[PDB]
């Protein structure tokens, strides 16, 4: 019943592909939402241009 989010931010100079290396992920936040999750989806930002 706990949703746990771990996060990490790194400055990467690679142009394409998942970089090879090790970096531990510090916990970001735990929430007692207590729901059932089976699917998910990502949302992106859009830049409106003339």
């Amino acid at each position: 019943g706990y949703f746990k989010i771990y996060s990490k931010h790194t400055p990467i100079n690679l142009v394409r592909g998942l970089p090879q290396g090790f970096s531990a992920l510090e916990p970001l936040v735990d929430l007692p939402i207590g729901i059932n999750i089976t699917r998910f989806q990502t949302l992106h930002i859009s830049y409106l241009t003339p």
């Binding site: 019943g1 706990y2 007692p32 207590g34």
Partner: protein, 49 residues
């Protein structure tokens, strides 16, 4: 305002404590004692005794 004592409005609030088979979300106030140092003491830190 001139009605009888038993005919006056009472503001009734019923608190219903629901306890399911799920992790709890409401708890009573947690207490704290002054921190003592350099002395064998019985310590409790967030349930770690």
């Amino acid at each position: 305002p001139t009605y009888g004592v038993g005919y006056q409005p009472y503001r009734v609030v019923v608190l219903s404590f629901e306890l399911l088979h799920a992790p709890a979300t409401v708890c009573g106030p947690k207490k704290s004692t002054n921190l003592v140092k350099n002395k064998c003491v019985n310590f409790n830190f967030n349930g770690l005794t």
